[PDB]
Amino acid sequence: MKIIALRSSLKLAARIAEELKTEPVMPDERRFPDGELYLRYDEDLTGHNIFIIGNTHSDAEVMEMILTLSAIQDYRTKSVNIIAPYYGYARQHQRYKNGEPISSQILTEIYSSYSNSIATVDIHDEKTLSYSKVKFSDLHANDAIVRYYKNVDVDYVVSPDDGGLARVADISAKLGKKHFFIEKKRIDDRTVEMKVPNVDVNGKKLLIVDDIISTGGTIAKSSGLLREKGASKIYVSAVHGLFVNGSENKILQNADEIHVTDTVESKFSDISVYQEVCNYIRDIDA
Amino acid sequence: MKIIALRSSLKLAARIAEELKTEPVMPDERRFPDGELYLRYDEDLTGHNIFIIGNTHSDAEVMEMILTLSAIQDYRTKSVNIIAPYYGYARQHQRYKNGEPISSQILTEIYSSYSNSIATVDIHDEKTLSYSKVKFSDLHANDAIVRYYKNVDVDYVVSPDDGGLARVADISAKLGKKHFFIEKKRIDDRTVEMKVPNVDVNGKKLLIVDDIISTGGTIAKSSGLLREKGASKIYVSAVHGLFVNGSENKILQNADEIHVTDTVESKFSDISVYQEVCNYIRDI
Ligand SMILES: Nc1ncnc2c1ncn2[C@@H]1O[C@H](COP(=O)(O)OP(=O)(O)O)[C@@H](O)[C@H]1O
Numbered sequence: 001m002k003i004i005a006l007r008s009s010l011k012l013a014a015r016i017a018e019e020l021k022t023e024p025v026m027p028d029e030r031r032f033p034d035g036e037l038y039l040r041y042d043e044d045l046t047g048h049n050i051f052i053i054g055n056t057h058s059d060a061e062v063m064e065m066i067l068t069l070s071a072i073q074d075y076r077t078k079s080v081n082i083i084a085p086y087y088g089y090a091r092q093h094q095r096y097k098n099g100e101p102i103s104s105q106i107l108t109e110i111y112s113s114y115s116n117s118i119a120t121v122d123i124h125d126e127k128t129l130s131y132s133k134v135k136f137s138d139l140h141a142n143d144a145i146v147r148y149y150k151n152v153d154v155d156y157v158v159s160p161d162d163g164g165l166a167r168v169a170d171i172s173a174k175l176g177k178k179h180f181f182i183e184k185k186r187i188d189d190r191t192v193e194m195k196v197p198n199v200d201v202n203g204k205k206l207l208i209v210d211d212i213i214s215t216g217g218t219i220a221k222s223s224g225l226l227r228e229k230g231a232s233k234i235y236v237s238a239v240h241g242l243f244v245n246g247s248e249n250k251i252l253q254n255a256d257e258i259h260v261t262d263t264v265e266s267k268f269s270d271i272s273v274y275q276e277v278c279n280y281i282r283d284i285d286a
Numbered sequence: 287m288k289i290i291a292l293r294s295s296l297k298l299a300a301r302i303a304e305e306l307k308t309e310p311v312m313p314d315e316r317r318f319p320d321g322e323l324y325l326r327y328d329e330d331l332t333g334h335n336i337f338i339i340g341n342t343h344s345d346a347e348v349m350e351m352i353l354t355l356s357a358i359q360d361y362r363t364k365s366v367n368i369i370a371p372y373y374g375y376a377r378q379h380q381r382y383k384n385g386e387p388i389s390s391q392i393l394t395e396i397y398s399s400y401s402n403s404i405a406t407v408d409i410h411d412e413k414t415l416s417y418s419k420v421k422f423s424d425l426h427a428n429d430a431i432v433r434y435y436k437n438v439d440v441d442y443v444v445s446p447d448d449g450g451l452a453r454v455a456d457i458s459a460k461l462g463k464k465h466f467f468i469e470k471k472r473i474d475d476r477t478v479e480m481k482v483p484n485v486d487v488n489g490k491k492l493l494i495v496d497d498i499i500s501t502g503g504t505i506a507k508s509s510g511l512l513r514e515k516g517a518s519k520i521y522v523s524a525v526h527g528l529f530v531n532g533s534e535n536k537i538l539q540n541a542d543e544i545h546v547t548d549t550v551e552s553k554f555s556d557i558s559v560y561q562e563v564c565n566y567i568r569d570i
């Protein structure tokens with residue numbers, strides 16, 4: 001096997017490569033004066049099962065992925081397998097207005113046409129898996145989150161909305177804890193919140209879990225409400241910590257700690273998903 | 287027909303639309319807070335021949351093109367036709383070292399998969415045309431350049447190197463002028479230059495023409511060679527004016543004027559290729 005480590009995923013790809021006792025192959029990469037991207041993989045990849053690890057969210061990450069998929073065609077590889085720990089554009093998985101792109105469809109079609117398999121960790125809406133011609137696997141960070149929190153005092157696991165329930169149910173069960181979710185709706189400029197079930201959180205330690213933290217509004221709001229109701233500790237976790245526009249600071253106004261995975265690397269990346277990705281890679285072989 | 291005008295090509299696209307008496311359809315476009323691109327074309331495109339006009343050079347231009355190609359699939363269109371006035375990645379049209387991408391190959395494959403035709407103005411190396419499943423046409427700015435210079439005093443048309451020859455030969459023929467090219471090579475850190483044929487440029491007015499101006503090094507060096515041999519006026523033209531940081535200054539050190547087309551819009555875009563693109567569209 002050969003593991004290719006793209007710029008966005010150096011940390012996670014390195015952990016994965018180290019665990020599988022192999023080189024994290026990085027490209028030589030630069031921008032030409034006109035801004036066009038240059039990449040080169042001088043290692044001989046012929047006859048190997050290739051695993052390309054890189055996120056697909058920023059314009060530059062997309063270019064890095066596409067050009068890599070061209071660069072590796074210089075070699076007679078056994079297979080080409082994309083692993084995008086965070087899969088960009090998964091939120092645009094249908095048309096919400098006439099004349100909108102299904103961004104996740106066209107991008108997934110492109111990736112599929114140049115690979116033998118695709119995988120990601122905790123995609124937003126599994127609909128997008130169906131846009132791929134090749135097998136598109138949705139890996140889960142559940143076990144990594146459990147391994148971190150088994151050593152934290154937690155009373156309830158909480159979903160900040162009435163989605164992401166399956167995840168919270170699984171994590172809570174593996175932790176041996178109960179769980180609940182928060183339903184937040186706006187009704188004529190006034191916000192109404194309900195806990196389901198209506199758990200008394202006074203003096204309780206709560207673990208809030210979501211797939212993505214981007215702007216952090218919902219989590220920040222729910223955290224404040226919970227603190228207001230007497231929660232003694234609030235831990236916030238998410239798989240993908242994008243942290244746009246001061247969201248970590250908004251959340252930390254009322255939550256005690258934030259812990260995310262290394263799918264998107266930041267100072268809050270304390271939970272590694274390297275094992276889950278390694279199990280997947282071993283399955284595909286090489 | 288419907289003309290879609292992307293961000294990078296609003297000026298040229300508007301000129302084309304006006305000439306064809308149609309709307310330059312622009313998207314609503316914004317970035318989400320996380321940086322992802324959003325586009326929307328709310329106009330009904332059903333049953334029309336669509337012409338998407340946008341460059342494909344920057345990361346953002348590539349995303350705008352790709353997402354547009356998805357957005358328009360919301361409509362049962364008669365045909366989808368891409369016109370990229372400046373076609374990005376045309377300089378990476380083969381592998382130059384092992385493990386490099388053939389960037390223009392995979393990008394052209396992607397575009398070809400989602401359209402019925404592609405066209406561009408003065409691609410760098412026609413090899414890239416062969417990477418398309420659909421007909422990929424190479425349009426030329428020659429006539430527009432000739433039209434502009436018909437009213438300028440020119441003695442010779444000049445190529446900065448031995449590759450832009452066909453263009454310079456055509457342009458000069460259409461202007462009724464002689465032409466030459468400059469061969470520049472480095473031999474042990476020192477520069478040697480040869481004019482072919484070995485024209486006397488002392489007191490002569492010269493029009494230098496190239497396809498692309500990026501850093502301007504090439505054009506600036508040639509302009510300098512010619513000025514020092516006594517050229518009285520030097521006009522610099524190119525189809526695609528990218529003008530990376532220091533370029534404009536470097537060129538105007540020895541050249542008098544710069545005039546490029548509107549394939550890439552800048553302060554120096556004095557020559558429009560709208561008529562050449564309108565011809566293509568009228569015939570497609
Ligand atoms: N990167 C992004 N950031 C924020 N919003 C996005 C992004 N991509 C798409 N969207 C928008 O998010 C909305 C859909 O989100 P959501 O309300 O969860 O609907 P769904 O339940 O179908 O996912 C759509 O209006 C879509 O255009």
Ligand SMILES: Nc1ncnc2c1ncn2[C@@H]1O[C@H](COP(=O)(O)OP(=O)(O)O)[C@@H](O)[C@H]1O
Pocket residue numbers: 032033034036375377378382
């Ligand atoms: N956007 C770009 N800007 C500058 N150089 C590039 C760009 N894209 C590719 N190149 C490089 O330009 C070189 C090819 O130029 P050149 O030596 O004239 O050969 P060719 O005749 O094939 O153009 C290659 O090394 C290629 O990697």
